Amino acid sequence: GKLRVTTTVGLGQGWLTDKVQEFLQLYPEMSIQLILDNEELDVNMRHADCAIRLRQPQQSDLIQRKLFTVHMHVYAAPSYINRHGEPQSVEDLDNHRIISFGEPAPNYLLDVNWLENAGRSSDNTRIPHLQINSQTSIKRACLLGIGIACLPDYIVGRDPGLIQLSLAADIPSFDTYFCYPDEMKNAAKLKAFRDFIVAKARNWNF
Amino acid sequence: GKLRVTTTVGLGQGWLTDKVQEFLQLYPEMSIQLILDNEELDVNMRHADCAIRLRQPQQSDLIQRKLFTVHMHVYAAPSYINRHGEPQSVEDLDNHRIISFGEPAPNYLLDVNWLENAGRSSDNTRIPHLQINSQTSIKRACLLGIGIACLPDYIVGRDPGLIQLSLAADIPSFDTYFCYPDEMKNAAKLKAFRDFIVAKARNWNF
C-alpha cells in the first residue's frame, strides 16, 4: 500500500528521490507519495504519514529519530573560477558574483542567504547576482558558472563537479530528523521505510 | 539593478535557470530574482516584476505575450524498459509502474496525473507506484528506472536519455505566456529580459 512522506523541496529533490528508488526496489508492493513543501505540513493532520525535517520537531506527540548532520559549504564551478579567480576570504566575496535563495525563506532553512550577510551588517548586505528559492536550481546555476553558492551537502552530493571554497569561515551545521505520529508506529509500511531511511542516513558520510 | 521573475517550480528548474545564465552573461550589471511557486503569485501586488505562466493570464491590466506551446509525452528510462518491457497501449499501463505528480495539483498544471486517469473512469484510477509533486523529481525518478512518467518537453529537454512511448493517445498541449504590469513596460531591465525570453521561446523547437 501507499506511504505518504513529506519533506522540504531541497531534501526531496536532492537526496530523497534517489533513496525512494532504492526503497521501492526492496518493497515493490509498496507505493510512495512524496509531498515536497517548504512549509512544514502538519503530519498529525494526516497530510502525510511521516516526515523528514531540517530541525528537531517540537510536537510532543511525534515519535522522532535524528538522521544525519547537514553541513553548509561554499562552492563555485571550474568555469567560474577560470574566469573570475578564487576568493581567499569572506571579504573577497565583495568582488565576486554570489548566488543565494532570496526572501521569503522558510524560518527553519538556516543560512540559505549566508553569502549576502557574511562579514556584513544586516543593513549593508551583499547584492546577489542571482537569487532562486530552489536549492537544486542554485546548484544548477553554480554548475553553469553564474557565481558562488552556499549549499548543503545533500544538494551537492559526493561528486559535485564543484570546487569547495575555503573562506576561513564556519557556516552552522544542522540536524535532520525522521518523525511520525504514534498512530503509525505499528504500521509495517512505516517500519520498513523508517528503518531503511535510518540505515541510509547513517551511511551518508559526506 | 534587480528584476524579479516568477514562474512555476517545474518551468523555473527545468528551463528558466539555464536561460537566466545566458541572460546574465549578456547583462552583467543586472541581477535576477527567480521566485518559483506553483501558486500563481500576484504580479500586480508587486511580488514580482514579471511572470511566465502555463495558462493565459486573465487579468486585463497585464501586458502578455504568448511564448511557446508545451507538449506532454510519456517516457521511460532504458533501465526500466530493459526490465519491464515497453507498453504498446494505454491499457498496457495496467501491467506497468507509473510515476505521477499526485494531489493536490495546481488547477493550471494540466494532465500531471494523466497516467492515473488515461482510459479509466474517475472512480477507478490506476494506483501509481510513485507520486512526487515536483516535475524535476518525476524526471529523476523516471531516469532511475522507477517507472513510466508523463512529462512536459521543457522538463525533458532535447537530449533526455528517455524513450518516448507511443501509447496511441494524445495528451493536450498548452501555451506559455510572458506577462508584466503596464507600470513596468518602460523599464529597460524588463525590456531586455522580455525580448531575450521571447527570442529564446521562439528558438525552443522541441
Residue numbers in the entry:
A (entry chain B), B (entry chain A): 95 to 300
Task: Copy out sentences from the published article reporting this entry, exactly as the authors wrote them.
Unlike many bacteria, Agrobacterium harbors another redox-associated LTTR, called LsrB (LysR-type symbiosis regulator B). LsrB is solely found in Rhizobiales, such as the plant symbiont Sinorhizobium meliloti or the intracellular mammalian pathogen Brucella abortus (there designated as VtlR = virulence-associated transcriptional LysR-family regulator). LsrB is a major regulator of various cellular responses, including the coordinated regulation of small RNAs, ABC transporter or β-lactam resistance genes.
To experimentally support the biocomputational structure model, we employed cryo-EM of purified LsrB. Instead of the expected tetramers, we captured LsrB dimers, likely due to unstable homotetrameric oligomerization in the absence of DNA. The results show that AlphaFold accurately predicted both (i) the dimeric interface of the two LsrB monomers and (ii) the spatial arrangement of the chains. Based on the validated 3D structure, we were able to localize the two pairs of cysteine residues (C144/C273 and C236/C244). Additionally, the predicted spatial separation of over 50 Å between cysteine residues from different monomers strongly argues against the possibility of intermolecular disulfide bond formation. In contrast, substitution of C273 led to increased H2O2 sensitivity reminiscent of the lsrB-deletion mutant phenotype. When LsrB was reduced with TCEP, which breaks the S-S bond and converts the cysteine residues back to their reduced form (-SH), and subsequently subjected to modification of cysteines with MMTS, which “traps” free thiol groups by forming mixed disulfides, peptides containing all four cysteine residues (C144, C236, C244, C273) were identified with MMTS modification.
